[PDB]
Amino acid sequence: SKKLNKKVLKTVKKASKAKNVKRGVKEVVKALRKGEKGLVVIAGDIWPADVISHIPVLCEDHSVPYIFIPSKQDLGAAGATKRPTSVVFIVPGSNKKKDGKNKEEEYKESFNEVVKEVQAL
């Protein structure tokens, strides 16, 4: 939980250059229904708190692991946006593209591990 956020920050920060991450309710839901949905990132220091309901709804609907950390700053930076977003999910290529060979493998690796620890806790 302590180092988890860190690993996630660096992971998204790297993959960010590849544009393998998206933000916005329309984005998270778009991938959630499409299938390319990867790892959902939720900021514990961002409003509105709608994310609280969008968390169980998106999971109970499609089921996707996410992380709860007030990294508002990291979110905006990793996303390359003006203001700090609220709901940001990472999209590792695609359903089949998930088996990439590039750095994507590393990023996903750290993500799965982290998203898993938090998902279980």
Describe this structure in words.
About 50% of the residues lie in helices and about 10% in strands. The protein has a single domain, classed as Ribosomal protein L30/S12 (60s Ribosomal Protein L30, Chain: A), CATH 3.30.1330. α1 packs parallel to α4 and α1 packs antiparallel against α5. By secondary structure, the chain is an alpha+beta fold. The chain contains 5 helices and 4 strands, in the order αβαβαβαβα. The chain has a 4-stranded mixed sheet, with helices on both faces. The PDB classes it as rna binding protein. Keywords: L7Ae, snoRNP, scaRNP, RNA binding protein. The assembly is monomeric. The entry is titled "Solution structure of the S. cerevisiae H/ACA RNP protein Nhp2p-S82W mutant". The protein is H/ACA ribonucleoprotein complex subunit 2.
Structural descriptors:
121 residues; alpha+beta; 60s Ribosomal Protein L30, Chain: A; 4-stranded mixed beta sheet; 5 helices; 4 strands; 12% strand; globular
